[PDB]
Amino acid sequence: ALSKVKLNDTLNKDQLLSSSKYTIQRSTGDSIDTPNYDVQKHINKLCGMLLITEDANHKFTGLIGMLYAMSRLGREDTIKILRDAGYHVKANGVDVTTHRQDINGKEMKFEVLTLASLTTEIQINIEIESRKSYKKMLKEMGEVAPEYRHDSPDCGMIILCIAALVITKLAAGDRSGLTAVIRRANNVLKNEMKRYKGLLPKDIANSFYEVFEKHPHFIDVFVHFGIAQSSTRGGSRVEGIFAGLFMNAYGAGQVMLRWGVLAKSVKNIMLGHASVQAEMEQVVEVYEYAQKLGGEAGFYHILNNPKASLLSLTQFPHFSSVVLGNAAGLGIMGEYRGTPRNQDLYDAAKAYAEQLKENGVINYSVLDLTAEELEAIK
Amino acid sequence: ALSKVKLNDTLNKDQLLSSSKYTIQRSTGDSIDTPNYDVQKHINKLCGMLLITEDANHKFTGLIGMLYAMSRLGREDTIKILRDAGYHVKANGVDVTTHRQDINGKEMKFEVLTLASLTTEIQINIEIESRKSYKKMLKEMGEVAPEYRHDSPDCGMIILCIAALVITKLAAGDRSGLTAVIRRANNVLKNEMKRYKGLLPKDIANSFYEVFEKHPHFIDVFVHFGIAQSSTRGGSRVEGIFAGLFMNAYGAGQVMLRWGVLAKSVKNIMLGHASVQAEMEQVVEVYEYAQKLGGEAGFYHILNNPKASLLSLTQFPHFSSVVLGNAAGLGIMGEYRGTPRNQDLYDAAKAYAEQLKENGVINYSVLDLTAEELEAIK
RNA sequence: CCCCCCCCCCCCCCCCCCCCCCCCCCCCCCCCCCCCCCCCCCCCCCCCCCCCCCCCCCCCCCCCCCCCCC
């Protein structure tokens, strides 16, 4: 039987990768500073002082944001995440210490954290700039409010909202989605931007891009923090904003699967072409693989998961061309810079998709109309 | 019943080989230097110093790359791999030692590893050349960056990417795919080649070819390392590149199975010929055997697995000729130097495959079009 | 190799209920006859017959696999 000449390559590769009986485990490099629940308020305070500082130095904002995420996860969950990702980690306990020094010829007391990644002088400088900005703002408006202060319990999660946007755009492979991050951070979080003068989306976003490029285990820690944060029973409005922006990253790097489902839904005719029909068996294999993976597959491209390549549809040039053409005709492809490699199928699918919007007829069979007196109403 | 005159030779041979109750186990030769997680940073450092050295001596790059792979696997997993492959191994512990010698009439301290395969003088020379190249580059551009240094944590995995390309081309039986390796290593890893002056794809590829020819157990260790590396939850971009290039080796040496599936998919008419139909029963037996093997069968030809011959379709000259002709007509066979041994079936299949691309009609039955007003739109 | 776009979400109105209504109610013990069952005839079996018998070892050719692109 010719119908039995089949190779389930996608499923076979998944079975090969998921039944490995040997494991590697990597070295993160320097010791990882793992804060616990104890210093969560101090890290949030540090984030607030970074936010209330106009022209803030956001060189360490990504590092502090990851510290905040790790303190909300806790030491035990963070360490377990790092083992499960397959990393050798030398965990550093983070505790609060007091430092007295003479700036402006005066003895003043400073409360800092013992971090190998973030030096004490840097934390002192952050606090000093925050104090200068705070007193300037107090002079220029008289009295401060809970809105304008480092004590707000959402100061860390605003920074983590910027981080969530950067995560949504990480699948592009570089800092190319920075403009989209800045735009969406102006639309979302506009009241916050009016609130905090040091909330500079570009600087914070560049800091998070940099920290994710340096430490690829921070991407893992942040994704699992965002899954744990979105697994709560509730929260504040800023935490809801973060959860909404973090689910915006689901399926990032896999737009062609969604656009193929859309091309099927609008019943594009070019899906019936002979070459597309030749590829349908394997494209269906890919879709069954994706829906077998389930929810974990939505962050494969963010995380640089090795099995991300198994979700690709570009190995089906005709189907991919029809899908891209349907997206182009429906006016959703935008500035997507993936290119069709079958120009004729792309053009035909685009033409039909454009024809779809102009036309359109009601299908009365999908309802339960027993008696159709609608003909007389015409 | 004439339909009961059948021999399931492929399944019977597989059952014979998989139910063996006696096992051989071989001798690897010299002692195998098995590094553990401890010296992973040192091996990665050695790889980085090899990469930053223009006109580098890549005679030992394959050996060092295998050392890096074995250190990411660890001593226990590497030793277990070597037992499971059926080898007597005398494992050598690898540890770091300090060596002081007088070069340029100065006492300087050198940090090396105790390897029976790689002598101390060789490691010292690698470090000395790296230092010369580093100072020359520093002079010619002023200040170095994390991009240009041995401390980058991906220096070993770039070398292992070259190794992955060599693995993809190992099924050709010799160093014939070296040009393809060099081309794909220029396309992929182009930013890295701009980054590292000692990244010479030809030299590294020849080193890995040589190490795989000398030690066939390194092929086993590397394949299982690449399966364990692709079984992680995530990583950096270079690790993702490695995983993508290592899945490029899946099914290597078995192109005719994939091309037969493709010939079935495009509905080549010559599959209905009388002789092809005579062979269909056994070719279907081969396909069921492949899909019963599953994912493990994708590396049978790389590994020189004995059961690789059971996946061959060349014992079916007419089916193979139709498959090769379909590939030739579709313009994918390229410079494949397997030859059809039924010229007429090859020519007929090629002619029909060429006819396929020019023609092509939409099959509206595969959609769910309840009402087809498309006839009026023509 | 892969990837590449865009995108927070939400937003209205709204307590519920409201009546009437206990149920039941009569008549009526049941039974009632006739009838033991059985009953004859009949041992069973009965012949013939060992089985087997020829011819015949089997085998015999050819053939590693792979090879592209990504």
Author numbering:
A (entry chain A), B (entry chain B): 2 to 379
Which passages does the manuscript contain on this structure?
The helical HRSV nucleocapsid is a template for the viral RNA synthesis and a scaffold for the virion assembly. The helical NC, together with the RNA polymerase L, its phosphoprotein cofactor P and the transcription factor M2-1, form the HRSV RNA synthesis complex that constitues the minimal infectious unit of the virus.
The 2.86 Å resolution map and the resulting atomic model of the N10 double ring show that the N protomer and the entire N10 ring are identical to the crystal structure, with 0.5-Å RMSD over 378 backbone residues and the density of the last twelve residues (380–391) largely disordered. The visible part of the CTD-arm of Ni lies on top of the CTD of Ni+1 implying that in a helical NC it should be situated in between consecutive turns. Examination of our HRSV double ring structure verifies the presence of the tripartite Y23-D221-R234 interaction and shows that it occurs inside the N-hole of Ni which carries D221; the loop 230–238 of Ni-1 provides R234 while Y23 is contributed by the loop 18–32 of Ni+1, whereas Y23 on the equivalent loop of Ni points into the N-hole of Ni-1 so that to bind R234 of Ni-2. Thus, an additional tripartite stabilisation of the “latch-bolt type” interaction seems to be a signature of the HRSV NCs. In the double ring, the NTD-NTD stacking of two N10 rings, whose centres of gravity are 67 Å apart, is assured by D1-symmetry-related β-sheets providing two opposing interacting H100 residues and two R101-E122 hydrogen bonds. Interestingly, examination of the crystal structures of HRSV and HMPV rings reveals their bottom-to-bottom (NTD-NTD) stacking but with a tighter packing, with an inter-ring distance of 61 Å and 60 Å respectively.
